[PDB]
Symmetry: C2
Subunit: 214 residues, 2 copies
């Protein structure tokens, strides 16, 4: 196999790299949902995403990726890139449809907001922030997909739509008031605080690479 | 305020006037509608800039869908429209996936969708299609929404335009040829090019 002996799938394994400013934006998305649902999971820190053993999990050679046991228990499943990992976790572990959608109607709005030089980058970003600000100014619309509660659409959008990412493009997040309220409110959720804390620490604890016990 | 001819008695697919560079995204949901045999209307939007179209799709692009649920629903952009149509009209799970396992691979290849950045993507597809029995992207046995989403991006026309010889990825060329032979894919490529060149240039058909 040429796969390290410490890589065993006895539960959901989330694949991450060493925590840095630019390495967490995507990996935190599935981790927020795992924390929200209380899904038992391991953390595997990949030393090199170019390693052939990791290409066989995710051929696009990026984190996040997931290996998990199939529902029957026989085989191993794989999910890769943030959007798919959120969809997989919602499928296998969100049985109430709390974050994934309870009916076709709810899943239709969730999937809409889930799947959605400098000035060109900065302008296209402000156009996105504008669409989100508009959505959140609609009557009763506290979250992006559903009015009542946050969904995977909200989790997939938070890393992009928060103060520290706005400052990175040199934008003032205050100028989108409803979106800033929404981002802070997402930020105050227990599962979200935990995800942002843990994802920055991976590779910097007791183990630098491989399967974390802690 | 809507156009008066915009009524939702069934699934309404919002397209634009058919060209070489307008049909790459809207063909995707149309292929699945054709595949499943879903009763649908076609709506040709003159200007996507129009405030009435922004009420349906805030990103102001096609494809978009308006539809009735089991008892009004919107779905915008190709990926979301493919997932909606599968959710509503694919009970069987023939294109959307029958179980957690099938849906894990389908969602992987569905969401995966300058010269170097397109070759890197083609190499991954070529590699997938050279795996034992892997004749479609997501499932070994039959095509899925993942195959529909990827077809317009992985064909000779698209490869040529981006400055690449599609013959360099032989299993991917063969895959796109097999998908091209599908009755529903021919019918969709027909109609998407036809839309806005019939009797009615704009509005409901």
């Amino acid at each position: 196999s040429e796969r390290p002996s410490d890589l065993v799938v006895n539960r959901l394994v989330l694949f991450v790299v060493k925590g840095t400013a630019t390495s967490t934006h995507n990996t935190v998305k599935p981790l927020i949902l795992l924390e929200e649902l209380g899904v038992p999971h391991d953390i595997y820190v990949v030393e090199k995403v170019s390693a052939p053993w990791f290409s066989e999990i995710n051929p696009h050679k990026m984190v996040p990726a997931i290996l998990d046991r199939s529902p029957d228990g026989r085989d191993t499943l794989r999910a890769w890139e943030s959007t798919s990992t959120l969809m997989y976790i919602a499928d296998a572990y969100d049985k109430d449809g709390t974050f994934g959608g309870r009916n076709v109607q709810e899943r239709s709005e969730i999937n809409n907001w889930l799947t959605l030089t400098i000035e060109k980058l900065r302008s296209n970003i402000t156009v996105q922030y504008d669409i989100l600000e508009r959505r959140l100014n609609e009557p009763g619309q506290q979250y992006l997909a559903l009015k009542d509660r946050p969904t995977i659409a909200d989790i997939a959008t938070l890393p992009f739509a928060m103060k520290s990412t706005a400052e990175l493009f040199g934008l003032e997040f205050e100028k989108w008031p409803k979106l800033q309220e929404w981002s802070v409110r997402m930020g105050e959720r227990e599962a979200v605080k935990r995800a942002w804390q843990r994802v920055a620490g991976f590779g910097h604890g007791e183990k630098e690479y491989g399967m974390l016990e802690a």
